[PDB]
C-alpha cells in the first residue's frame, strides 16, 4: 500500500494527492445514546461532503477538474511552489478566506453546464 490513513499529512501535496482512497474508506443508557449520537453525526458530515460533490458534478470523483479559472486574488503562487512544497494543511489555511467563495463558483459552473447540456441534446 502507501503510508496509510492520513500518513501524508505533513507530506508534499504532490505525493499526498496519490492514494486518496485511504482516507475515503475510514470516513464512514449513557453509552448507547452517546454512541448512537456519534453514528448519526458521522452520516451527516459525510453526506454534506457527497452533497457538495453532487452539486459540483463531481459525485463519484476523488480528483475532479472544473471550469472556474484560478483567480490569483486567492493565491499568486506557482503550481510548483504548491504541489512540491506546501502540505495540504498549509495550503487550505491560505485559501481559508476564499474557500466559501470558490464553493459558490463551482455550483454555478455545474448549473450552467447542465443548462447548456440540456440545449445540446435538444438536437
Amino acid at each position, epitope marked *: 500500500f502507501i503510508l496509510g490513513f492520513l500518513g501524508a499529512a505533513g507530506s*508534499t501535496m*504532490g*505525493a499526498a494527492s496519490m492514494a486518496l482512497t485511504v482516507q475515503a474508506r475510514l470516513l464512514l443508557t449513557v453509552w448507547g445514546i452517546k454512541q448512537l449520537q456519534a453514528r448519526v453525526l458521522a452520516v451527516e458530515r459525510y453526506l454534506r461532503d457527497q452533497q457538495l460533490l453532487g452539486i459540483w458534478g463531481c459525485s463519484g470523483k476523488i480528483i475532479c477538474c472544473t471550469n472556474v479559472p484560478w483567480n490569483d486574488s486567492w493565491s499568486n503562487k506557482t503550481i*510548483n*511552489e504548491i504541489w*512540491d*512544497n506546501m502540505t495540504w494543511m498549509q495550503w487550505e489555511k491560505e485559501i481559508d478566506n476564499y474557500t466559501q467563495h470558490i464553493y459558490t463558483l463551482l455550483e454555478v459552473s455545474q448549473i450552467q453546464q447542465e443548462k447548456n447540456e440540456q440545449e445540446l441534446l435538444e438536437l
Partner: nanobody, 128 residues
Framework: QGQLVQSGATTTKPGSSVKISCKTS????????INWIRQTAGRGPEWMGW????????????????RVNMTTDTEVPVTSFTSTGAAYMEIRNLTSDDTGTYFC????????????????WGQGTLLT
C-alpha cells in the same frame, strides 16, 4: 523565509581545521536540504555539498569528499511549521588556497527536480 545565521570570521593556519556553524529559524529545518558554498580568491564560486536535516543524507562534490566533516543538529520545534536547527561544516587538510567566504544555503523545495537548489543563503564567514 527564515534566517540562516552562521559563525564569525575565524582564521587559522594551514593543516588545521575550522568549524563553521549555521543556525536556522523561521522555517521547518527538516523539510529542506542544507548546502555549503564558498568563493575563494583564486577561483570563482564552488559547490561543496548538501546534507538532509531529515534523511541524514550527504552528497558532496568529489573535489571536497575526503576533506569535509558535515553534520546537523535536530530542529527544536517552535510552531507546527517553524523550527530552529543548526548545520556544521569542518574541513581536513586546510591550506591558504581554501581562503575565502563561506555560507550555508537552505534548499529550494521539498519535491520535484529542483529540491536541493541552494535558495536561501546565510550571511558569510571569512576563513584563513
Amino acid at each position: 523565509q527564515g534566517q540562516l545565521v552562521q559563525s564569525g570570521a575565524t582564521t587559522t593556519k594551514p593543516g588545521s581545521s575550522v568549524k563553521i556553524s549555521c543556525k536556522t529559524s523561521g522555517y521547518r529545518f527538516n523539510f529542506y536540504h542544507i548546502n555549503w558554498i564558498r568563493q575563494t580568491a583564486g577561483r570563482g564560486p564552488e559547490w561543496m555539498g548538501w546534507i538532509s536535516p531529515y534523511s541524514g543524507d550527504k552528497n558532496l562534490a568529489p573535489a571536497f569528499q575526503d576533506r569535509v566533516n558535515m553534520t546537523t543538529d535536530t530542529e527544536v520545534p517552535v510552531t507546527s511549521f517553524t523550527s530552529t536547527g543548526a548545520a556544521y561544516m569542518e574541513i581536513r587538510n586546510l591550506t591558504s588556497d581554501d581562503t575565502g567566504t563561506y555560507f550555508c544555503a537552505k534548499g529550494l523545495l521539498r519535491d520535484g527536480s529542483s529540491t536541493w537548489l541552494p535558495y536561501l543563503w546565510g550571511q558569510g564567514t571569512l576563513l584563513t
